[PDB]
Amino acid sequence: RVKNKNPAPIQISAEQLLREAVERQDVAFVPPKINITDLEELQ
Amino acid sequence: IDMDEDEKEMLSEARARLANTQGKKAKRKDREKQLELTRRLSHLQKRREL
Amino acid sequence: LKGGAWKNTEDEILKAAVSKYGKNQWARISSLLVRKTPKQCKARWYEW
Amino acid sequence: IQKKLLPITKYRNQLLYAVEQNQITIVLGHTGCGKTTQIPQFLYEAGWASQNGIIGCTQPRRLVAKSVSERVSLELNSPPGSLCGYSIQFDHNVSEKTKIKYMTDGILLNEIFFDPLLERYSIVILDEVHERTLSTDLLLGVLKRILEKRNDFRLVLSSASVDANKLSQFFGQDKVCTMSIEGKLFPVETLFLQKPTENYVDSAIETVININSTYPPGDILVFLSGRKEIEYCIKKIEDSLIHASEDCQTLVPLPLHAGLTVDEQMRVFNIYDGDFRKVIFSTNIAETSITIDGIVYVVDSGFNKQRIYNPYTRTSKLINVPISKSSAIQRSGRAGRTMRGKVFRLYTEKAYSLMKEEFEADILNCDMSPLVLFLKGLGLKNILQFPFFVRPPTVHLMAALEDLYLLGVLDESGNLTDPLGIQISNSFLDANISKALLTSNQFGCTHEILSIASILTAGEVFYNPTSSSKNDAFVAHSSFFANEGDIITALNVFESFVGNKKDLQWCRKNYLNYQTLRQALDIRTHLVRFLNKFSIPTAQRLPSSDCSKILKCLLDGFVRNVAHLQNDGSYKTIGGKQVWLDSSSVLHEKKTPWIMYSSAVESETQIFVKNISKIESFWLDKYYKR
Amino acid sequence: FDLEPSRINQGVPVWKQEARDERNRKRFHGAFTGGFSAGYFNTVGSKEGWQPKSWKSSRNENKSVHGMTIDDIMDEEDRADQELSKVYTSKINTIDTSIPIDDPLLREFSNRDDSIGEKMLKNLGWNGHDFVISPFQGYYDDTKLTNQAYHGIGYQADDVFQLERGGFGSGVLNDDGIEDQDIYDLGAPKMRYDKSINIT
RNA sequence: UCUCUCUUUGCCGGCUUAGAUCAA
């Protein structure tokens, strides 16, 4: 009936906001490492 | 429990805002470095396939 | 339009924005809350 | 069983005696008592439809006509269309064996036009004439004439308003019986303010809040001016819900107006179980043909919106007017259907003492240009000879006549000009739109003009969501933006619509109203038959991309409706009127030098035009010079 | 010409609409359009150039040397505003429009603007003598009364609360104030002034 | 003396009129 004015059992908290905002980050970008197969690219 | 729907929109925008950091135009330099890395990888891959 | 009754979500976003921004950037904080003005955000922070 | 429970069963013998012994009978009663559905059954049982006789009962509303026809067919335990059928404008579902016929007023006027004496019907009952539609009153005027000529033909008049005395004088007292049915209504007590109100919605919201906290459960139906305050009431009612006390029921607000989608209008009928009290914010829809049960308390503002057309400027505006006395009684009596209910009209009885009793007819509040075509087609040289129930304003009639003359359908003497005039008279549509179709034969491009006319008459073929889907609707239309205006945009949409296999998912995806397109298909089929009546082929298409000659035909059809851009952003109509482009049209800011429109809607400050299409000056010059 | 991508506008009405872009760039061009450059590149010429055509007159070779026409020397703005500036003729629209006649006093002095319509009324056999009016005209009076102002039916309102030279411009962004009105004033002669006042 | 884990563990961009402004 989408009219559930009943106060939520879990109220939104500020620390929750900052935590779930930070959660948007992931691991450091992983690039496929370059393979030095010969001497010139090593140089 | 369902506090309408515009509040969800503003909550999403606020969540994106609070953790965005990194300034505003610092997003250009890292992107340029990524593109240069991609182009040099393409050059090297072309050389090795040659 | 503008104003209202300061729903709990608005109060919580205000607290988080003061955490991240400070007490001297009320316009920037009020940019988060579409329904409120910088004067209103400052008034709520200093009154409630 | 439901037939026998209705109060009308006890008047069957009396109604039959009065209908038979009197040429014209005036029946007064309340909607839903069985007059709409049981009078045809009663006279069929009497034998009025016996021996090739047909029961033609007029229902001036298309949806109501079809629904009542289906209900009567099902109630008589007969296959649909076999004994009872329906015939609405530009949509026919009838049969030779059908005896009880529910028909629209315009088709009946057309039948009068082809058959002056209605030889195939012995009795016709006019129902739902209380709305005073243009077609209804024109039909009444012609029907007095047919009763004058026909002694065998019988008339039964059913109305929800007390107009019988005027009809009695108009029809002659010696041939009309004024009979009133005695229904049953729970006593409703009226409550009035001691002092005039300043802000009736704030007066209304105060009473709405007071009813919830102090009265037993029951849905409150409000009456509001228009759709702009509806959402305003939603917002305050939601705030009141947020601050509701434990002793007050959960009060749900429900809009009800004409601009809603059908599903939104179906949302009101939903049953809210538990301690939920419905409140229906209805403008005027909850006045007729609406039977929501459980309505207990009604607060009436006394203001209703309506439409007025200006002949001097060819515009139409939505204005607020205090309601008539009859509307006040109907609003008071709407509450109390299931149990006792109270009404709170937001004014004083001294205010009630001044309003005019009954709202004027639509024959006195619509465009009479179609009416003049009808009379001229029947052969009435002097319009004053026709028996109008109420004399229409002469200046409006003269506006229509000068418009028709400058349109070419009437000569200098005011008679129909050439086959053009009679052929226009034969057309159901307005004379302005029909001219393009009839002149399209000279240029062999009737098809695209036919599609344009069908789209125009059917209505809006685009759907504009109120949610975030507005960008999605815009992108869906973004494939079909025509540089030359909305009309060629509509042509492209219509052409590609049939090219997508009539896929309903495609119509949803492109935000296109399929219902409008189907109605346009029916309209165009009937107009194809209309042209074939004149032996005009309808396989004519323009093989070239130049839409210029289509535009010549249109400019011949919209001669009066041209405008050019001004520096201030507005447009000067050829008639020296300052107008503004509607935001919906594509050419909102393109600053097109010369523009051509079809319809004008006027607001308190700006006159807005619709159906925007660009044109070139030399076409207008060459057309005007000849 | 693809009318450019139309999705850029979306909603966001006038006071947030970015800036007009001639070539999807934020820049004005033209002296009277706000640009600091006019013409090709602050110059009269064009990209390709311009040359006169060859001339030869021998009473038979000048016949191929025709005259000069309007369009051949204009450009796209000039043609656009030539189309914009064409307004004339009209005639027939003006004769049968506007206010033909109404009220007994006007019938006598004011010419019936209906004109040919008077002959049309001859066709209807008007024979009105005293004219006939309809309550729609009382509702046509509502076009000149009010549209209501969200007030109640019985609300009497108040009389104190109802309300209703040239040169170059100061700049469209420079606004108006006490500064920008006509210092030379001779308007409002008597419509704002009473003709008499009660002494007691 | 290896291995694993935990814990203790002292620890490693500036300025100005807040630069100035901000209604879907």
Swiss-Prot record, chain A:
Top-level taxon: Eukaryota
UniProt subcellular location: Nucleus
Family: Belongs to the crooked-neck family.
Quaternary data: Belongs to the 40S cdc5-associated complex (or cwf complex), a spliceosome sub-complex reminiscent of a late-stage spliceosome composed of the U2, U5 and U6 snRNAs and at least brr2, cdc5, cwf2/prp3, cwf3/syf1, cwf4/syf3, cwf5/ecm2, spp42/cwf6, cwf7/spf27, cwf8, cwf9, cwf10, cwf11, cwf12, prp45/cwf13, cwf14, cwf15, cwf16, cwf17, cwf18, cwf19, cwf20, cwf21, cwf22, cwf23, cwf24, cwf25, cwf26, cyp7/cwf27, cwf28, cwf29/ist3, lea1, msl1, prp5/cwf1, prp10, prp12/sap130, prp17, prp22, sap61, sap62, sap114, sap145, slu7, smb1, smd1, smd3, smf1, smg1 and syf2.
Biological role: Involved in pre-mRNA splicing and cell cycle progression. Required for the spliceosome assembly and initiation of the DNA replication.
Protein name from the UniProt record: Pre-mRNA-splicing factor cwf4
Lineage of the species this protein comes from: Eukaryota, Fungi, Dikarya, Ascomycota, Taphrinomycotina
Parent sequence residues shown: 7 to 49 of 674
Swiss-Prot record, chain C:
Localization annotation: Nucleus
Ranges of the DNA-binding region feature: 26-48
Domain HTH myb-type: 1-48
Domain of life: Eukaryota
Role noted for this protein: Involved in mRNA splicing and cell cycle control.
Family, per entry: Belongs to the CEF1 family.
Assembly notes: Belongs to the 40S cdc5-associated complex (or cwf complex), a spliceosome sub-complex reminiscent of a late-stage spliceosome composed of the U2, U5 and U6 snRNAs and at least brr2, cdc5, cwf2/prp3, cwf3/syf1, cwf4/syf3, cwf5/ecm2, spp42/cwf6, cwf7/spf27, cwf8, cwf9, cwf10, cwf11, cwf12, prp45/cwf13, cwf14, cwf15, cwf16, cwf17, cwf18, cwf19, cwf20, cwf21, cwf22, cwf23, cwf24, cwf25, cwf26, cyp7/cwf27, cwf28, cwf29/ist3, lea1, msl1, prp5/cwf1, prp10, prp12/sap130, prp17, prp22, sap61, sap62, sap114, sap145, slu7, smb1, smd1, smd3, smf1, smg1 and syf2. Interacts with sde2.
Protein name: Pre-mRNA-splicing factor cdc5
Organism of provenance: Schizosaccharomyces pombe (strain 972 / ATCC 24843)
Residues of the full protein shown: 4 to 51 of 757
Swiss-Prot record, chain D:
Entry GO CC: catalytic step 2 spliceosome; cytosol; nucleus; spliceosomal complex
Gene Ontology terms describing biological process: mRNA cis splicing, via spliceosome; mRNA splicing, via spliceosome
Family of this protein: Belongs to the DEAD box helicase family. DEAH subfamily.
Positions of the Helicase ATP-binding domain: 16-180
Annotated Gene3D superfamilies: 1.20.120.1080, P-loop containing nucleotide triphosphate hydrolases
Top-rank lineage group of the source organism: Eukaryota
Reactions the enzyme catalyzes: ATP + H2O = ADP + phosphate + H(+)
Localization of this protein: Nucleus
Keyword annotations: ATP-binding, Helicase, Hydrolase, mRNA processing, mRNA splicing, Nucleotide-binding, Nucleus
CDD domains for the chain: DEXHc_RHA-like, SF2_C_RHA
Originating organism: Schizosaccharomyces pombe (strain 972 / ATCC 24843)
Protein name: Putative pre-mRNA-splicing factor ATP-dependent RNA helicase C20H4.09
Motif window: DEAH box: 127-130
Example of a GO MF term: ATP hydrolysis activity
A Pfam family it matches: HA2_C
Its biological purpose: Pre-mRNA processing factor involved in disassembly of spliceosomes after the release of mature mRNA.
Residues given in the record as ATP binding sites: 29-36
Protein EC: 3.6.4.13
Swiss-Prot record, chain E:
Subcellular location(s) per record: Cytoplasm; Nucleus
The protein's name in its UniProt record: Uncharacterized protein C20H4.06c
Organism: Schizosaccharomyces pombe (strain 972 / ATCC 24843) (Fission yeast)
Biological classification of the source: Eukaryota, Fungi, Dikarya, Ascomycota, Taphrinomycotina
